[model samples]
Target: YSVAGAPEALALRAGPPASVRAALLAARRRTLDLADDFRAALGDAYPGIGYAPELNPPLWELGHVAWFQEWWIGRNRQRARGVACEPDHAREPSLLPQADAWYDSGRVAHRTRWALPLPDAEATRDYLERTLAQTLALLDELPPDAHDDALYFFRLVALHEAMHAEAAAYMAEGLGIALRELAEDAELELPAQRLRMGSDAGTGFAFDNELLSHDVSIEPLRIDAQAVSWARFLPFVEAGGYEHPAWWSDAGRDWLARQLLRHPAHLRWQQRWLPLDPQGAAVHLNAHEAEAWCRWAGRRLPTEAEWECAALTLPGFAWGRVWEWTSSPFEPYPGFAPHPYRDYSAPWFGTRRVLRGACHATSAALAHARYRNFFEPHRRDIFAGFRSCRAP
Candidate 1:
């Protein structure tokens, strides 16, 4: 389930000329590895028609990954510039004749993807190989300074692929397929300090959601040295955490009622409880479940600011177990500006819950202390969990 450091490797920073090519290759390798894993998870009886609603068809996802890279790096007209490039802008033609209609996620609706007559596995692999070769060539043409704005789109696509790979892992888990156990460490506790939120000045490009660094004052608080373990969280499940409405937020209570659940656990595996490993990090949690568990234990979820403060300021702070839900809503900074990828962050603003830290399936290169991940509060299909903070 883990692909360590893949995301971090894709981050654009000043490095030797060979580093860009190496990172891009690494990202592509992991993407294919995830695609293979997903194929295995679905077995030979893979759905030709509508597959699980929670997941895109494995082959379709693979081609889309290549199309995304080609769209941003190979075909993008503004690839050499620092400004936001529109998805529909004029660009170099796609290598495949039906590429746009078949693989353009921005233009092709999700429901229609299943209905499209997509190319088979071999053709998709060809597209992946050709687009990757083109991307590497484009990377070679850029200036020696790897962190230059000119290379932003290159890094963007790499990060994007790494992210989709993680999503693939979560989709596998939702389908009840077994995966390798995630690595874990003993929990640690730390004192708090004033923390600077978001990326610092002069850093190379970041996602629009992580823009415009700002100061955030944090009080001394003890945080989970590692993620909260299933051994620790199971007590809440056994104690009927879901049946009690007092422990949940107003919206969370409503979610529970709508689902008609008697226990807070994955719907498919609700009959019995067994941790992947007792000491392992908990996964497959939604914000409502996390909130209820926090209340049951007399603790509270950390705010997004607090989670970042602990992750950055404390020595040996461990994360990347699962996507940890914070108490904060997804919102823009004091002076927010949308990046060229308009659909990335702007669409979900104010409507989603903010999650910080990375999940076990997250690519190592993409796991930043400040990278903001978000989802709707009721979405339990994602690989997510929470660590508690002392309530004021």
Candidate 2:
């Protein structure tokens, strides 16, 4: 399936500056809209939504997104340094005096987020608007010939906000709150091919984990053209897939026991049960469930490298529906170097699985093929799914 398509949004790494401005503006618009949407969904419980292991307070999360943009662009004196800037570089103060204490994710403990005296929804909205305005003003200050180095933070923060935008959608999904999501189709059309995986330098903005382009030769494989749908995945549940220990791995069995996931309440079709869109991709699936389904189907999930090759090389290979899990563990390529924002990928390299493709909640700006999204296998609260691959 060597159907070639031009790399979309890859040029943003070294932008013409105009698109950089547009991306920054567009991302913020989505963020603010989601912010308002969150408030509407939660109603009077907007700021004080129930505490959970997977969620942050909506108001606090809104402030954190703004704080991150301010930290990297507005407040930092070395905004021009891009990837080369020191991680701990000194910076100017934030517009919000307590912003760092309130929203610095690296410093603020996750469990403590709810306890913090975060700004209310109105103040948080004001903060978001001001930070984005400042970002646009800063974008106007860049030199005429600015490309990769100068435009890096602009692209980084814009896409960063976009990532959070996707987060808002998924968080809403988990909270049973409505937010816009905003795909699947596949066949095993690829011949055996040796491919270079990961981003090439200057191909626009590359994430830290996507560094050090490396070679991976894949044998001919049959992968789905899209994510496996509930129409496909639910039958396994109906057939006692979760109950069959033979279909599950040791780790998976333990997860299954803890979760009691056998035809969970959400999968029920009628009789006071949660009805789902069967045509929709099988979502909110953890890696264990994906593995069980694969084992039961006599198939397997594709490795991230294999998934990446099929996506970039095969024209019929479709994604951007639900985040699809890969068999590959999340690890650095050869000579991996952490970008200045060290927490992004380095810490969880070995603990998580790699997911290729975006979900409905993902941002349009995140359509880059080389981007790697990783998560702990037990997390199913996000919009994630899996496709099966069979080896010849």
Candidate 3:
């Protein structure tokens, strides 16, 4: 895993048919397991409903993940047509009568989801099971030549559900439901190297943003082999880092001023400083908070290019605890063209900061060096943290 390009080049290549089916099943099973965990962890918190501004109702998300698969794979009119059809081409009616009303993200607004008349837990599980059975059956029937084109949706849905599975873990954290630890930290020194920053289409189905690999010349930089830990971050909080506007950017200053707390910390446990495990990566921090801490420590956030360079080239480089924020903004590469999954990267291009590395909740298969995750700079509830690049 230390050689980023090595594994990634392999990752981009397709797996055998049986393995793809196995991966699809594994992804579905994991999503189901996470849904069960989310329900058990909540107990009677919201009674029959779940509500969080940043999260979908756990039950609803579970259903939607399955519904999405059925919509794109089972019912899609363009499936048999292979890559020759439009991405937004018309689709046949859903097998489930209530699918659109219940799980379509475009039709459902976030705030209103909590109030929706969603099916009970049992019914939602039934829907997920039915959808998955059909999806798997379709996979079995797909022609060998069409595997490259038709199986694309199969893999896409699997990756989608895997992301929601991670989201479920962080939502549990937000609800004060304890989950297992996700990442660890280490200190390391890295040398300068010229690194190619993205993947192309032929390389095993990367998102549109990761396309068209290109070279980035990195300066000599020092980076945390792992993410920054809470034990290290606590000192900044204790010294009134939030109170000093000098450490913040103009945007960071505004973000800080709007906060209700005298000192900002992650939600779910901010009553007082929680004792930090010296090895745990700092979690639940916004970019502004991460940025201010970098200033406070006289360090800087690594650019996305530097983060990828170290991840691919350096030995003993481990990530995947928290989605580490980077200094780079989320923009397209030199020859960027929109992929079929149009909404994935293009819409958020200019407004958000880039996050490199995956969080603990992220699936091992989906977390890769070329994956570009983006979020608005102020989002704090996500399982996110940062690693610093030394100022040279």
Candidate 4:
């Protein structure tokens, strides 16, 4: 949906300066499809739409995406023009008339977004279109690099929308409406081989960490040929993977113990536990469950590098379908630096573990090697899944 959305931002370097404009416009068109799907799922009314969290509301998410474009592209013009509703623009100032009052991530709370009763949907949409039109005029008037920050964040926020659209898709599915397909919607079986991991940087400008492609040998691996069906994981649940100390990390087990959870996370719906592919009986498993299964199967989980190597090294497939859990902790590459996006990958490096390969919940446009996603090992809330690996 991001590829076709409005008042959208362009990818900074995937193509020529002309392509940047095209990408941004395409992104806006896609955003409309996203908004339609989400609004249908979430309502125009309060309590928004479903049992999902505040971040999952369709209206809020759609508005926020548009708001983000204006926030970055409009600069502080709305305020200077005596717009009484000018909100704080955060640290964002750009060549575009970037206005930050409503869309800044640092400013918007997951819960508060749904409460934005002011900029009605039509107004929000109008603001976004105007913002993009202005940005288009400015881009046409100046040098290719004129007001680069606006383009940078505009693109950045565009990708951000792509990401959230996927998130919203999953949230919708979790609410019982099928938003998209699963990684194993059919069955994808990757062969076992020692492959190098990391982005080649040949695919155009990627995130800072994705800039430098690295070589890391992987061991032989066997993934689901398709994802593990919900029926398959039921055995683990029947055996109480969450309760068994043998299946959890010292930390994970401790957390399970604290929550006293007998089953896995997000295992709701009619008192029945479901999988990603109910027909195929396959369901997605989070890092904790993957680790539990690894322990149960007497095999260790793949190191982050091993998982990366498998998914990225000799890439034949899209990378961001379902985030794949790797044993590797989210650590810096040899000479990691905070690039223009700043603070994107550094702070989360050591503390969190990495997940490679995207899932249905991941935006397809964001697919690339080296796109590192991190979460605490115990977080099953995000759309996470796993594949198995062993030493060669």
Candidate 5:
């Protein structure tokens, strides 16, 4: 589906209630582990990162994760209605009385996040534990035949937590914390084809932008079988690709003017950045850099439709190492509708570029082939990279 906000990756976990429960639990465990990583990485400096547009305060982030689950699942009176539920529906009180004031992301502005009097990490963990227990208890009440709408929030909450986990990874990368590495393949020759391009009703719960699935015809195209590897991308950098304005767009030149260095800041031979594996998919390249690389190489980034079609139908197309940028903008599909979690997709429409594939940090629960991830063109702080196809 086409809900291309700054969402992240995971395997598809939107199945029966039991599996959804397991995914929720697994997501919580990843959240806690990553939170621990943050604390350990910072030590006495823990919770002290200066605010940046790309990050949230670790403590606030942890609390907000729990608050989101509680606000939507345990406290929402219309949870059963799913996408049909009014986003502004009146709901039960939060287990944490100040949750709305402190963690309501829509209400809480980004610049003010660091200064909020949020609870300490320990208390936030307890809150997460309690809210998750309550959430599972509610899940227990649903029948095996619970309709997709009835099961929607559970699926959504799990995906939401996974998104947080990935954001935390992005923050970690931005802070120079280490993480992990993928392979390269030849271009695949894709034949012309026609198929439905978005999520269909009754298939399962889907983000609204991915709704109203419709038929689309793709002409024959030549596309990358794998994301561009650093081994391949390195030569362009070696050739002073960043220094050449001809390889960059006007906007890309402006973004380049603000930078002090030519290469990605996340470049280090340390733990997660993979210099050891030249075949590994390049990470931390932004849309400007990806587009520049494509331009330098006489190729182009694929449209979201091309990316989706290749991912679903072609046997050679491989991803999941890093989020790959697409040529498409994050617009709503025809007959677009917003889902109950109002901010999930609509707000970022038309402004952000679409990304496809999962990253190393993504939970196994959110990796649906049709899922669309997105971000502003200048952002490379997230675990993002790109693939190129012969211009088609």
Candidate 6:
């Protein structure tokens, strides 16, 4: 439940042999879609200033996507054969020589992503194709009834890919990068109703924490029928929300002070303040900006419980809004039990902050109300924002 080295958000079915296979196939396609979407967001000049140096360049990210599948699905699981690829990569382990050449995270220079001898956009597309084809070939032969261990790893890899896809978009924003906007699902309005906040094990295959369901009392909260828009948040900035202390936490205030930043997060140019379509400019906000807006309105951000409650209560898209920061710290639930991924959930409980919901790059397939994402409070520049509920 704690925010730490990122959480996996893969949602697949745990069911009849046939059903599970179907879920895995579906997940593979969704994961590929996430990767492709991110690449498409990069536009023609991907490695340009639109993305951060710390953040992998668009080419680097795409390469890593392939490297990951090759490592987890191909090498780890030995499914590289039978896939279509350049003659040598068709049976190779890393998929492309450039996989390690261009994407060795260890070797890549920080602040030099734009300088990398990145291949043209077309080559990057080919690399993505090769990696995906290999993965699909292996997946087709994977034995059904691959128990918790193997199947779990598969899901982790897929979710890891999606997680990076989301992170890459945020990286672009931090680097003053303008990217294509992602489309939102047409809004689905649901009647106001009390919603259960806990995970129902039988609802589908989910992480252990997502399995335990609990009842929650809802007090007629009306969320934005959609994500809060940049125009909506700009008002908070124009009002000098950043200069007001009443809207910040003790730590948030301290962060504001240490940085002496009075402007909104990810502000690059005066003109950049304007919002563009998902297929145009990407959406991002600094953590300080989000908190300041919540404070100015006399409303506080929601806790993970409050977020999950909203997500589960609504029968429609739950995570399409910006990743929602919750008031709750990362901690284990009642009667907590650690799974094989030891230290995965509990170790970071006290130090990290919790975030709920998902962002634009998030594939709808992996969105689940119970999915818990966490990061430190001082570290909120990524693709995250918050919605407020009345103070308890």
* lDDT winner: 5
TM-score, predicted candidate 1 vs. hidden true structure: 0.89
- Write down the lDDT that model 1 would get: 0.75
RMSD after CA superposition, every candidate: 3.6, 2.5, 3.2, 7.0, 3.4, 8.1
Predicted structure 4: lDDT: 0.55
Q: Which stretches of candidate 4 lie over 4 Å from their true place?
A: 1-13, 46-57, 71-99, 109-117, 138-155, 174-197, 200-203, 215-226, 258-261, 265-284, 313-321
Residue 136 accuracy (lDDT) in model 4: 65
Winner by TM-score between candidate 5 and candidate 4: 5
Q: What are the per-model numbers of colliding residue pairs?
A: 12, 13, 3, 40, 8, 8
Candidate 4 per-residue lDDT, tens place, 17-99, comes to: 46556666766666776666655665445436644352445655666666666554455343222212234435445322323
For each candidate, the alpha-carbon lDDT, in order, equals 0.75, 0.80, 0.75, 0.55, 0.81, 0.56
TM-score for all predictions?
Answer: 0.89, 0.94, 0.89, 0.73, 0.93, 0.65
lDDT of 3 by residue, 1-392 (tens): 25343342233235544555776777777787776666667652323345556877777787789788888788877765443447777777776777888788877878877776767788778888888888888788866554556666766777787788888777777766655432445566767667778875555566778867888788987787778877788789889998999999999999998989845465333422464465677877889999999999989999898888888777767788889999899999888877666677888898999998888677766788888889998997788899887944
* Inter-residue clash pairs, candidate 5: 2-210, 10-366, 10-367, 11-364, 11-365, 11-366, 11-367, 179-272
User: Which of the predicted structures, 1 or 2, would earn the higher lDDT when compared with the native?
Assistant: 2
Candidate no. 6 TM-score: 0.65
Candidate 5 CA-lDDT value: 0.81
Worst 10 residues of 6 by lDDT: 79-88
| Residue 213 in candidate 1, Cα distance off native in Å | 0.4
After superposition, candidate 6 runs with Cα above 4 Å error? 1-54, 77-130, 142-151, 178-239, 258-261, 266-283, 314-319, 334-348, 379-381
In model 6, residue pairs whose N, Cα or C atoms come closer than 3 Å (at least 3 residues apart or on different chains), thus clashing, are 3-374, 50-177, 180-278, 181-278, 181-279, 181-280, 182-278, 198-214
TM value for model 5: 0.93
**Using TM-score as the measure, which candidate wins?**
2
